[PDB]
RNA sequence: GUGAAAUUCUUGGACCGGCGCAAGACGGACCAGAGCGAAAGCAUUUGCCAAGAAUGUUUUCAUUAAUCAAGAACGAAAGUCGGAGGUUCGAAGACGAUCAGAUACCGUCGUAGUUCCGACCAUAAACGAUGCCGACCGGCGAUGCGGCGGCGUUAUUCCCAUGACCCGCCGGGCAGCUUCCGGGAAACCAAAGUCUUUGGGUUCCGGGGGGAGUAUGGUUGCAAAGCUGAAACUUAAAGGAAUUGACGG
């Protein structure tokens, strides 16, 4: 069930049971990891490389070829942002949602919608902090956070 | 059907199933060498691709995205690979 | 006319009159009460446009169009529902091959194009590959304002 | 006790449905819950089409008919006679009356 | 039908109109016995139009939401 | 008594009540 | 769809070229030779409107007329304060084309 | 700290006047004196200087506006509708 | 106008038929045991603004989750305040009827209100009288959305798409029919089942009927009232589902 949603849905990526490499796969681990670093200098987030990786070099999954995930490689060069992907694009919703709301005074539904995505990023944001991927005293502001965000 | 055999289900009913509700779980996709007429190399594309791919060097749109598999341009070969 | 259909109405207003003669010009068309109803059924979807349009003589009308979804001959469901953005791009595709056929040309020809109402009958053919529509008329057409009343522009479409 | 599961309305996945009035006697009905007519009746009586033939100027003059979208509470339904009080097992079938055709 | 007669006219165009508005759409019963009589008292009788008043949506209908209770 | 009107009853009440204790 | 373009691609001028904000260097750089695009907000004083077009038009740069006002042409360079007039020396996002 | 829990600025006035008549000329006071950004300049120094002359210190610029307001919710629909009948007058 | 009348409007043309103008409401028919939304609720055309389910996915993070005291958001209608506007309808009220009486049911007029903006209020038979998340346990025919396939027809064109049909499949929904799955006091329910063969996790909540959602205290509100919430006292039943009979303006 949805964490803010009264749906079901079962829309998922089933992963296949072959965990060994394609033969037909004449890109190598290095062949791989250059790429990666280029299209992350290009200003993809790691949810956007591994769809081009997949739909234009034909690699089943970075995890299997390389050995490692996507942002294990792209935080061991060190050129990762420091935001998670998903905490980014929450906060950067939030942004769009308050610009919005702020115009458009009696779009109750808009308010409803505000709470329910920050409930989402205070619970993501708790997460990180556990895993120290953001510091203690982080916060998510709603009057810093057009700041933060973009 | 108090004796359905759950151990050994014959494929046709299980290419009916659900990726997820199989015995094992088998994905719907793939990857197909697709071949763009008025070229010579062949570019691996995924068959759910969600982007317009594109050559290295052809200036020519092979698919499109679409709700759920690649939307092939008219005249552009393709072929599985190892099912 | 001759021959032709019943249902459809006219209102001819008198603009002039000598002798002992009145004469009339076109002012509005108008479906009937009982064949606009026999139209309206379900598990169809309608669609009704209007757009403010302007002759080349300086009249300006309000052009209203209704259109039917058709259950086809081999049909089994029980209705023939149009989806929204379907009913969207008809009533936009109908609105701009219903200004175009009156802004190109004249009243007179907008006029005698409507008494067979070609306009409907290409308004259907162009939206067959979207949605079959089968039951399209023009539903109804005011005029808004009239330029000046010339004698002289009368006086020819009364007479050669 | 409740006495019908279709809960004497056609509302199913909705929350509101707007009302209507009944044509009989102006009761604010809700859409769904008040029972629809569509007659489409002659505009002559039955007996009175051979009398209008013989004074129709046009020899082929096709009849227009009237139609009407009568909506009733249950109360006027009732009292018209247009529906009535059913068995318990007679209740639960959705098929209409026949039309008495031939 | 008489003053028709003597004034010269021969043949009708019939305009029946029900109450129309937020109101019945149904004739009365007068509708059939003047329609009837006109064309039996040596009338013509041509196109039969409604000009009942069908509004897209009317005014509130008087009476009250519980009806006209009887 | 139908329970609205029981309801309404005990509103004039309680209005009572109020006017009452409120005054001294 | 001019406007919501305009807004992120001087969103990528910032942090990818370089740029100069406020009038008096706008001048500066636009009688240098090496201004490219100058964007006035609305909210200009219409003297200075007329006179920087008269100096671009000396300097063969393009004037952008931004539907805004200084307040958020401000907000859309990035900065906290209000923006008049600024002048792009290379865009470094193709908002100009070559 | 919070000084009042509802007066605001009409605390000036005491227990006088009554509670809904400080209530009613609260929200004037407050419209009154503030500061509104200014149009042609972009900053926040128009403050009214009589009834109905309101002035940028930073611009030196002077409007005619409301009594207690920059600009009144009439005058405002009323300068769309000349625009709308201007664009009307010709085509 | 009514069952019948009457108060009422009318030779100054009342009603009616035609042509205009103005105002304020409301979006019929299409409109469905159809859709969406957390609910309340949402229906003329087009444009803009953000939002969302489901689907597809060999994309990504890697336990980030379920329910939740305290706390908070939204919340039909009616009601309150201020400002607009007030067509129709219409509490209060008046008059005519009806009646033994008729402060009503019927009719004529009619104030607040009914519409918009801002600020309150937080209640409904706010109902599916049925908590949420998860799993398992019959069948069948449909429907909405998305997707995957397939004879053929149709729209264009010369062919695929691409729409519209026809036959299936998948998932997620609103439902529907049937069943000795099982349960239940039964009505009935594929959930109200998997419950003496009693335990998936977790909120709220009832203890015979009244007194009573009353008194009091606290708290919210401009007010109307809202939240929390007893006791003394009284009583042998009050109720639920079905059966038979009686009765029904
Ligand atoms: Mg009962
Ligand atoms: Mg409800
Ligand atoms: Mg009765
Ligand atoms: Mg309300
Ligand atoms: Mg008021
Ligand atoms: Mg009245
Ligand atoms: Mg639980
Ligand atoms: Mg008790
Ligand atoms: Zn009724
Ligand atoms: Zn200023």
Redesign the interface.
Known sequence: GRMHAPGKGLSQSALPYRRSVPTWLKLTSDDVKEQIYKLAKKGLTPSQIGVILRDSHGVAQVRFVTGNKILRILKSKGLAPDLPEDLYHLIKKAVAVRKHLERNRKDKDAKFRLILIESRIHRLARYYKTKRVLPPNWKYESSTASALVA | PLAKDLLHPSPEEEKRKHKKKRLVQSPNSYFMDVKCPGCYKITTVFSHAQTVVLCVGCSTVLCQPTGGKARLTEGCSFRRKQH | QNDEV?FR?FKLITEDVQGKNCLTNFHGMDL???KM??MVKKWQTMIEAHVDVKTTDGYLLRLFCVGFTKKRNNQIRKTSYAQHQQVRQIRKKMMEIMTREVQTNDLKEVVNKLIPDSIGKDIEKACQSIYPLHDVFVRKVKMLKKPKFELGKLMELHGE | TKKRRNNGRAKKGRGHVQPIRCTNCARCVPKDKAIKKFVIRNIVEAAAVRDISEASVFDAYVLPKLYVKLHYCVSCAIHSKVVRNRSREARKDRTPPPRFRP | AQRCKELGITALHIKLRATGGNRTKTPGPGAQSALRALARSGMKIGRIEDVTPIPSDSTRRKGGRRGRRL | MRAKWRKKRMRRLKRKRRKMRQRS | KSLESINSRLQLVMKSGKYVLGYKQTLKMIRQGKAKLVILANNCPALRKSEIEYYAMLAKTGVHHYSGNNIELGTACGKYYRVCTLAIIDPGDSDIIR | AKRTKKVGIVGKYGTRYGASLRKMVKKIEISQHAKYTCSFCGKTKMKRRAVGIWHCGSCMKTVAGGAWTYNTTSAVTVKSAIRRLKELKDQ
Do not use: V, W
Request: with cysteine; proline share 0%; aromatic share 0%.
């Open positions: 019943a109405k009937t009460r009982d109803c026999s």
